[PDB]
CSV table of C-alpha atoms and ligand atoms in Angstrom, one decimal:
chain,number,residue,atom,x,y,z
A,1,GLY,CA,46.5,-6.0,112.7
A,2,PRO,CA,42.8,-5.0,111.9
A,3,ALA,CA,43.6,-2.3,114.3
A,4,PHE,CA,46.6,-1.0,112.2
A,5,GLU,CA,44.2,-0.9,109.2
A,6,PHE,CA,41.6,1.1,111.2
A,7,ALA,CA,44.7,3.4,112.4
A,8,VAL,CA,46.0,4.3,108.7
A,9,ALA,CA,42.5,5.2,107.6
A,10,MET,CA,41.7,7.2,110.9
A,11,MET,CA,44.9,9.3,110.4
A,12,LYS,CA,44.6,9.8,106.7
A,13,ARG,CA,41.0,11.2,107.1
A,14,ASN,CA,41.3,12.9,110.6
A,15,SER,CA,44.9,13.8,111.7
A,16,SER,CA,47.2,16.6,111.2
A,17,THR,CA,50.4,18.0,112.1
A,18,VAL,CA,50.1,21.0,114.4
A,19,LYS,CA,52.7,23.5,115.4
A,20,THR,CA,52.5,25.8,118.3
A,21,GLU,CA,54.6,28.2,120.3
A,22,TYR,CA,54.8,25.3,122.7
A,23,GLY,CA,55.9,22.6,120.1
A,24,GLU,CA,54.7,20.1,117.6
A,25,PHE,CA,52.0,17.7,118.1
A,26,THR,CA,49.7,15.6,116.5
A,27,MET,CA,46.0,16.8,116.1
A,28,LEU,CA,42.8,14.7,115.9
A,29,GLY,CA,39.8,16.0,114.1
A,30,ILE,CA,36.6,15.0,115.8
A,31,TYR,CA,33.6,16.3,113.8
A,32,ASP,CA,32.5,19.6,111.9
A,33,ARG,CA,35.7,21.7,112.6
A,34,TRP,CA,36.3,20.8,116.2
A,35,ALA,CA,39.4,19.1,117.0
A,36,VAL,CA,41.5,18.2,119.9
A,37,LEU,CA,45.0,18.9,121.1
A,38,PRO,CA,46.9,17.8,124.4
A,39,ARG,CA,46.5,20.7,126.8
A,40,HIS,CA,50.0,21.5,127.2
A,41,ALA,CA,50.3,22.5,123.4
A,42,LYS,CA,48.5,25.7,124.6
A,43,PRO,CA,47.4,26.9,121.1
A,44,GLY,CA,46.9,30.8,120.6
A,45,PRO,CA,44.3,32.4,118.2
A,46,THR,CA,46.3,30.8,115.4
A,47,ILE,CA,48.0,27.4,114.8
A,48,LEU,CA,50.4,25.8,111.9
A,49,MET,CA,48.2,22.9,110.8
A,50,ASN,CA,50.0,21.0,108.0
A,51,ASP,CA,52.6,23.8,107.6
A,52,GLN,CA,49.7,26.1,107.0
A,53,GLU,CA,48.3,29.0,109.2
A,54,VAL,CA,44.7,28.3,110.5
A,55,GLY,CA,42.7,30.4,112.9
A,56,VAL,CA,41.8,28.9,116.0
A,57,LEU,CA,38.3,30.7,116.8
A,58,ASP,CA,37.6,28.8,120.2
A,59,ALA,CA,39.3,26.9,122.7
A,60,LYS,CA,38.7,24.9,125.7
A,61,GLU,CA,41.1,23.5,128.3
A,62,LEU,CA,38.9,20.7,129.5
A,63,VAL,CA,38.2,19.9,133.2
A,64,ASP,CA,36.2,17.4,135.0
A,65,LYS,CA,33.3,18.4,137.7
A,66,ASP,CA,35.8,19.4,140.2
A,67,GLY,CA,38.1,21.7,137.9
A,68,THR,CA,40.6,18.7,137.8
A,69,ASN,CA,42.8,18.7,134.6
A,70,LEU,CA,41.9,16.4,131.7
A,71,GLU,CA,44.8,17.6,129.8
A,72,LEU,CA,42.6,18.3,126.5
A,73,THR,CA,42.0,21.3,124.7
A,74,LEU,CA,39.0,21.3,122.2
A,75,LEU,CA,39.7,23.7,119.4
A,76,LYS,CA,37.1,25.1,116.7
A,77,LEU,CA,39.2,25.8,113.7
A,78,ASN,CA,38.6,28.5,111.0
A,79,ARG,CA,38.7,26.4,107.9
A,80,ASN,CA,35.9,25.4,105.3
A,81,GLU,CA,36.8,21.7,105.3
A,82,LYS,CA,34.9,19.4,107.9
A,83,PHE,CA,36.2,16.6,109.5
A,84,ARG,CA,34.6,13.2,109.2
A,85,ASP,CA,32.5,12.8,112.2
A,86,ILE,CA,34.4,10.1,114.4
A,87,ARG,CA,32.3,10.2,117.5
A,88,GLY,CA,30.9,6.9,117.0
A,89,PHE,CA,34.3,5.7,117.6
A,90,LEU,CA,34.3,7.2,121.2
A,91,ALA,CA,33.5,5.5,124.3
A,92,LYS,CA,31.2,6.8,126.7
A,93,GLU,CA,33.8,5.8,129.3
A,94,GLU,CA,37.5,4.8,129.7
A,95,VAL,CA,37.7,1.7,127.7
A,96,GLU,CA,40.6,-1.1,128.6
A,97,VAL,CA,42.3,-2.9,125.9
A,98,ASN,CA,44.8,-5.9,125.4
A,99,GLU,CA,46.2,-4.5,122.2
A,100,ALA,CA,46.5,-1.0,121.0
A,101,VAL,CA,47.6,1.3,118.1
A,102,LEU,CA,49.4,4.6,119.1
A,103,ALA,CA,49.7,6.8,115.8
A,104,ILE,CA,51.7,9.6,115.4
A,105,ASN,CA,51.7,12.2,112.7
A,106,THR,CA,54.5,14.8,113.3
A,107,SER,CA,57.9,15.8,111.0
A,108,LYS,CA,59.5,14.2,113.9
A,109,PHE,CA,57.5,11.0,113.5
A,110,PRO,CA,55.7,11.3,110.2
A,111,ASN,CA,52.7,8.5,109.9
A,112,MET,CA,54.4,6.4,112.0
A,113,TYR,CA,52.6,3.6,114.3
A,114,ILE,CA,53.5,1.7,117.5
A,115,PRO,CA,52.0,-1.2,119.2
A,116,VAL,CA,51.7,-0.5,122.8
A,117,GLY,CA,50.1,-3.6,124.1
A,118,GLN,CA,47.9,-3.6,127.2
A,119,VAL,CA,46.1,-0.4,127.8
A,120,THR,CA,45.1,0.3,131.4
A,121,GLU,CA,42.9,2.5,133.4
A,122,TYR,CA,45.5,4.2,135.5
A,123,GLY,CA,43.4,7.0,137.1
A,124,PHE,CA,45.0,10.0,138.5
A,125,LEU,CA,48.5,11.2,137.7
A,126,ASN,CA,50.6,14.2,138.4
A,127,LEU,CA,51.8,15.4,135.1
A,128,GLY,CA,54.2,18.3,134.7
A,129,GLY,CA,53.1,18.9,138.5
A,130,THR,CA,49.5,19.3,137.4
A,131,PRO,CA,47.1,16.4,139.1
A,132,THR,CA,45.5,14.6,136.0
A,133,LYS,CA,42.4,12.4,135.6
A,134,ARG,CA,41.3,9.8,133.4
A,135,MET,CA,44.5,8.9,132.1
A,136,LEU,CA,45.1,5.7,129.9
A,137,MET,CA,48.5,3.9,130.5
A,138,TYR,CA,50.5,1.7,128.4
A,139,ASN,CA,54.4,0.4,128.6
A,140,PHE,CA,56.1,3.0,126.4
A,141,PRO,CA,59.7,3.3,125.9
A,142,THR,CA,58.7,7.1,125.1
A,143,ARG,CA,60.0,10.1,123.5
A,144,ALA,CA,59.1,13.8,123.3
A,145,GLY,CA,57.3,14.1,119.7
A,146,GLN,CA,54.5,11.8,120.4
A,147,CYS,CA,52.2,14.3,122.0
A,148,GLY,CA,48.6,14.0,120.5
A,149,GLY,CA,49.4,10.7,119.3
A,150,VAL,CA,46.3,9.1,118.6
A,151,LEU,CA,45.6,5.6,120.8
A,152,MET,CA,43.2,3.4,119.0
A,153,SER,CA,42.0,-0.4,118.7
A,154,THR,CA,39.7,-1.9,116.0
A,155,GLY,CA,36.7,0.2,115.5
A,156,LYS,CA,37.9,2.2,118.9
A,157,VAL,CA,39.5,5.8,119.2
A,158,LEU,CA,40.5,5.5,122.7
A,159,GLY,CA,42.6,8.7,123.7
A,160,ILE,CA,45.3,11.2,122.8
A,161,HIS,CA,49.0,10.7,124.2
A,162,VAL,CA,49.8,13.3,126.6
A,163,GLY,CA,52.9,12.4,128.3
A,164,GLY,CA,55.4,9.6,129.7
A,165,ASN,CA,57.8,9.0,132.2
A,166,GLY,CA,60.4,7.2,130.0
A,167,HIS,CA,59.1,3.7,130.4
A,168,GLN,CA,55.3,4.4,130.1
A,169,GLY,CA,53.0,6.5,128.2
A,170,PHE,CA,49.8,8.2,129.2
A,171,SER,CA,46.6,9.1,127.0
A,172,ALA,CA,44.0,11.3,127.8
A,173,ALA,CA,40.8,9.3,127.2
A,174,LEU,CA,38.5,10.8,124.6
A,175,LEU,CA,35.0,10.6,126.1
A,176,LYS,CA,31.7,10.7,123.9
A,177,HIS,CA,30.4,13.7,126.0
A,178,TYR,CA,33.1,15.9,125.6
A,179,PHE,CA,31.9,16.5,122.1
A,180,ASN,CA,28.2,17.3,122.3
A,181,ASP,CA,28.1,21.0,123.2
A,182,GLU,CA,25.9,23.0,121.2
A,183,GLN,CA,26.9,24.2,117.2
B,1,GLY,CA,47.1,-4.7,107.7
B,2,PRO,CA,47.8,-8.6,107.6
B,3,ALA,CA,51.3,-6.9,106.5
B,4,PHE,CA,51.6,-5.0,109.8
B,5,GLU,CA,50.6,-8.4,111.6
B,6,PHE,CA,53.4,-10.1,109.9
B,7,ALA,CA,55.9,-7.1,110.6
B,8,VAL,CA,55.1,-7.1,114.3
B,9,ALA,CA,56.0,-11.0,114.6
B,10,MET,CA,59.3,-10.7,112.3
B,11,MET,CA,60.7,-7.6,114.4
B,12,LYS,CA,59.7,-9.4,117.7
B,13,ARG,CA,61.5,-12.8,116.6
B,14,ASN,CA,64.4,-11.5,114.2
B,15,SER,CA,65.1,-7.8,114.6
B,16,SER,CA,67.3,-6.0,117.1
B,17,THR,CA,68.9,-2.6,118.1
B,18,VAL,CA,72.6,-2.5,116.8
B,19,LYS,CA,75.1,0.2,117.6
B,20,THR,CA,78.4,0.6,115.8
B,21,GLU,CA,81.1,3.5,115.8
B,22,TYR,CA,79.1,4.3,112.8
B,23,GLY,CA,75.8,5.0,114.8
B,24,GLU,CA,72.7,3.1,115.5
B,25,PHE,CA,71.0,0.7,113.1
B,26,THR,CA,68.3,-2.0,113.1
B,27,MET,CA,69.7,-5.6,112.4
B,28,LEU,CA,68.0,-8.2,110.8
B,29,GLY,CA,68.5,-11.9,111.9
B,30,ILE,CA,68.6,-14.2,108.8
B,31,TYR,CA,69.3,-17.5,109.9
B,32,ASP,CA,71.4,-19.7,112.5
B,33,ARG,CA,73.5,-16.6,113.8
B,34,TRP,CA,74.0,-14.8,110.4
B,35,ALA,CA,72.7,-11.3,110.3
B,36,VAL,CA,72.2,-8.4,108.0
B,37,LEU,CA,73.5,-4.9,108.4
B,38,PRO,CA,73.4,-1.7,105.9
B,39,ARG,CA,77.1,-1.5,104.7
B,40,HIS,CA,77.5,2.0,105.8
B,41,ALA,CA,77.2,0.6,109.5
B,42,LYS,CA,80.7,-0.8,109.3
B,43,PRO,CA,80.8,-3.1,112.1
B,44,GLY,CA,84.1,-4.2,113.7
B,45,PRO,CA,85.0,-7.1,115.6
B,46,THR,CA,82.4,-6.1,118.2
B,47,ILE,CA,79.0,-4.6,118.1
B,48,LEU,CA,76.4,-3.7,120.5
B,49,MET,CA,73.2,-5.5,120.1
B,50,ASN,CA,70.3,-4.7,122.4
B,51,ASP,CA,72.8,-2.7,124.8
B,52,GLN,CA,74.8,-5.6,125.0
B,53,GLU,CA,78.4,-6.4,123.7
B,54,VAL,CA,78.4,-9.3,121.0
B,55,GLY,CA,81.2,-10.4,118.9
B,56,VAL,CA,81.2,-10.2,115.0
B,57,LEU,CA,83.1,-13.5,114.0
B,58,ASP,CA,82.8,-12.7,110.4
B,59,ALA,CA,81.7,-9.8,108.0
B,60,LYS,CA,81.1,-9.9,104.4
B,61,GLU,CA,80.3,-6.3,102.4
B,62,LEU,CA,78.2,-7.9,99.5
B,63,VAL,CA,78.9,-6.9,96.0
B,64,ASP,CA,77.4,-8.1,92.6
B,65,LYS,CA,79.3,-10.0,89.8
B,66,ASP,CA,81.3,-6.7,88.8
B,67,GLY,CA,82.2,-5.7,92.3
B,68,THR,CA,79.2,-3.0,92.4
B,69,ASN,CA,77.9,-2.2,95.9
B,70,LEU,CA,74.8,-4.0,97.2
B,71,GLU,CA,74.9,-1.9,100.4
B,72,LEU,CA,74.7,-5.1,102.4
B,73,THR,CA,76.9,-6.5,105.2
B,74,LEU,CA,76.6,-10.0,106.4
B,75,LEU,CA,77.9,-10.5,109.9
B,76,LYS,CA,78.3,-13.9,111.6
B,77,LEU,CA,77.4,-13.4,115.4
B,78,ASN,CA,79.3,-14.7,118.5
B,79,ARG,CA,76.1,-15.9,120.4
B,80,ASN,CA,74.3,-19.0,121.3
B,81,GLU,CA,70.9,-18.1,120.1
B,82,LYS,CA,69.9,-18.9,116.8
B,83,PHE,CA,67.7,-16.8,114.6
B,84,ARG,CA,64.5,-18.3,113.3
B,85,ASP,CA,65.2,-19.1,109.4
B,86,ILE,CA,63.4,-16.3,107.7
B,87,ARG,CA,64.8,-17.3,104.1
B,88,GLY,CA,61.5,-18.5,102.8
B,89,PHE,CA,60.4,-15.0,103.3
B,90,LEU,CA,63.1,-13.9,100.8
B,91,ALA,CA,62.5,-13.6,97.0
B,92,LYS,CA,65.1,-15.1,94.5
B,93,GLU,CA,64.8,-11.3,92.7
B,94,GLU,CA,63.6,-7.9,93.3
B,95,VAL,CA,59.9,-8.1,94.0
B,96,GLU,CA,57.6,-5.1,93.4
B,97,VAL,CA,54.8,-4.4,95.6
B,98,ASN,CA,51.8,-2.0,96.0
B,99,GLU,CA,51.8,-1.8,99.7
B,100,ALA,CA,54.6,-2.2,102.1
B,101,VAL,CA,55.8,-1.5,105.7
B,102,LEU,CA,58.8,-0.3,107.0
B,103,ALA,CA,59.6,-1.5,110.4
B,104,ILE,CA,62.3,0.1,112.7
B,105,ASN,CA,63.6,-0.7,116.0
B,106,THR,CA,66.2,1.7,117.3
B,107,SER,CA,66.0,3.8,120.6
B,108,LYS,CA,65.5,7.0,118.2
B,109,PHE,CA,62.7,4.8,116.6
B,110,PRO,CA,61.7,2.1,118.9
B,111,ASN,CA,59.2,-0.7,117.7
B,112,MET,CA,57.9,1.7,115.1
B,113,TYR,CA,56.1,0.9,111.7
B,114,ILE,CA,55.4,3.1,108.7
B,115,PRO,CA,53.4,2.4,105.5
B,116,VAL,CA,55.5,3.6,102.5
B,117,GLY,CA,52.9,2.7,99.9
B,118,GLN,CA,54.2,1.6,96.7
B,119,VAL,CA,57.6,-0.2,96.4
B,120,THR,CA,59.6,0.5,93.2
B,121,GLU,CA,62.6,-1.3,91.3
B,122,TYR,CA,64.6,1.8,91.0
B,123,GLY,CA,67.7,0.1,89.9
B,124,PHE,CA,71.1,1.9,90.2
B,125,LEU,CA,71.6,4.9,92.4
B,126,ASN,CA,74.5,6.9,93.9
B,127,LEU,CA,74.5,6.7,97.6
B,128,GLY,CA,77.0,8.4,99.7
B,129,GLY,CA,79.1,8.9,96.3
B,130,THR,CA,78.9,4.9,95.9
B,131,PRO,CA,77.0,3.3,92.9
B,132,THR,CA,74.6,0.9,94.4
B,133,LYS,CA,72.5,-1.7,92.8
B,134,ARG,CA,69.3,-3.5,93.5
B,135,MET,CA,67.8,-0.6,95.1
B,136,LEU,CA,64.1,-0.8,96.0
B,137,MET,CA,62.4,2.6,96.4
B,138,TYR,CA,59.6,4.1,98.1
B,139,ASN,CA,58.0,7.6,98.9
B,140,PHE,CA,59.7,8.4,102.2
B,141,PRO,CA,59.5,11.4,104.1
B,142,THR,CA,63.0,10.4,105.6
B,143,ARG,CA,65.0,10.7,108.8
B,144,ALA,CA,68.3,9.5,109.6
B,145,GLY,CA,68.0,6.6,112.4
B,146,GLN,CA,65.8,4.3,110.0
B,147,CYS,CA,68.8,2.5,108.3
B,148,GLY,CA,68.3,-1.1,108.9
B,149,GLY,CA,64.6,-0.5,108.7
B,150,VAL,CA,63.1,-3.7,107.4
B,151,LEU,CA,60.9,-3.5,104.4
B,152,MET,CA,58.1,-6.0,104.3
B,153,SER,CA,54.6,-6.8,102.9
B,154,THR,CA,52.6,-9.9,103.6
B,155,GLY,CA,54.5,-13.0,103.6
B,156,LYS,CA,57.4,-11.0,102.3
B,157,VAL,CA,60.7,-9.6,103.7
B,158,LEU,CA,61.6,-7.3,100.8
B,159,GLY,CA,64.8,-5.6,102.0
B,160,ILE,CA,66.8,-3.6,104.3
B,161,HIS,CA,66.5,0.6,104.5
B,162,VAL,CA,69.8,1.8,103.5
B,163,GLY,CA,69.3,5.6,102.9
B,164,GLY,CA,67.0,8.4,101.6
B,165,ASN,CA,66.9,11.8,99.8
B,166,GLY,CA,64.8,13.8,102.2
B,167,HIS,CA,61.7,12.7,100.1
B,168,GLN,CA,62.3,9.2,99.2
B,169,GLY,CA,63.6,6.1,100.8
B,170,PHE,CA,65.7,3.3,99.5
B,171,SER,CA,66.1,-0.4,100.6
B,172,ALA,CA,68.8,-2.9,99.5
B,173,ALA,CA,66.7,-6.1,98.4
B,174,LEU,CA,67.2,-9.0,100.4
B,175,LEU,CA,67.8,-11.7,98.0
B,176,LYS,CA,67.7,-15.7,98.5
B,177,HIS,CA,71.3,-16.6,97.4
B,178,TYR,CA,73.2,-13.9,99.3
B,179,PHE,CA,72.3,-16.5,102.3
B,180,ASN,CA,73.2,-19.8,100.9
B,181,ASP,CA,77.2,-19.9,101.6
B,182,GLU,CA,78.2,-23.1,103.5
B,183,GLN,CA,77.8,-23.2,107.2
C,201,CL,CL1,31.1,8.2,114.3
C,202,CL,CL1,61.9,-19.7,106.1
């Protein structure tokens, strides 16, 4: 409710439609020109961001201290415009929530919003046969085309949607410290 | 915002997924067991409502005083359960609104919600080559699968989504007097 209001503004300011050779995804702008995609989008030296061709200057598939998959890629974009800094909205740790909003911005699902209800700390999961940490789970009658979906509550950006099993969806949690490094 | 809150509860209480031989649609329950579909869903003596087979006892394609298409079919369902009476939420006339929510409940788009912005009294329109009155229009990067989508604002059920042109969506306005007749 206020969660939706927060979600609409978030998507307007910070989200875009991205196409890779791997498919179409939602991208969440974080700060400066640093943005996040789900890992399986596998962005090359160039992406199509909002039907437009933007260079990717740098890309990091993120891993935990053991080399375990976090399912996020951090990209730096070649574009003049700077995202609003949304890092104050990111927790230092996996946040659980009774009521969330998943926000999708593709051409399959343009500016759409789903209430997913209870968001749980699921932990580990095999996703595309890859062991994956820090998954947030919610009861999600899924469909492909929601990868990159931003999962949110009021005042809170919780994570990025990176898969489902038909009946549940999973988000990679967006943690504060993924987003410090250098300048 | 409060519009979303109103929309979630509306869909929970009063909306369903309907399949006809013409496709899959959202159905809005009005009162008692009277419900509405867009006209082009063309429901037979039976529909599939929420993966389940429900008889249709009676069906009226609605027309204005001239026999012009309103693009709504009113169905009476063979089912024990009674819809909550949402007619207090229906205007006596085409309502214009600065900010609306379109709410879709299919298996293509399950429990999804779109902000459409400004809703305008468009008037007449040829829709599937059929002249159609009392269309409400909004800027809608469309897709098939949203027919029956319920268009709403706060405290207001405005109409039922019955088509688009790629760039705009159209709703048949849900007027108070469509829903009096007898018992
Ligand atoms: Cl911030
Ligand atoms: Cl009422």
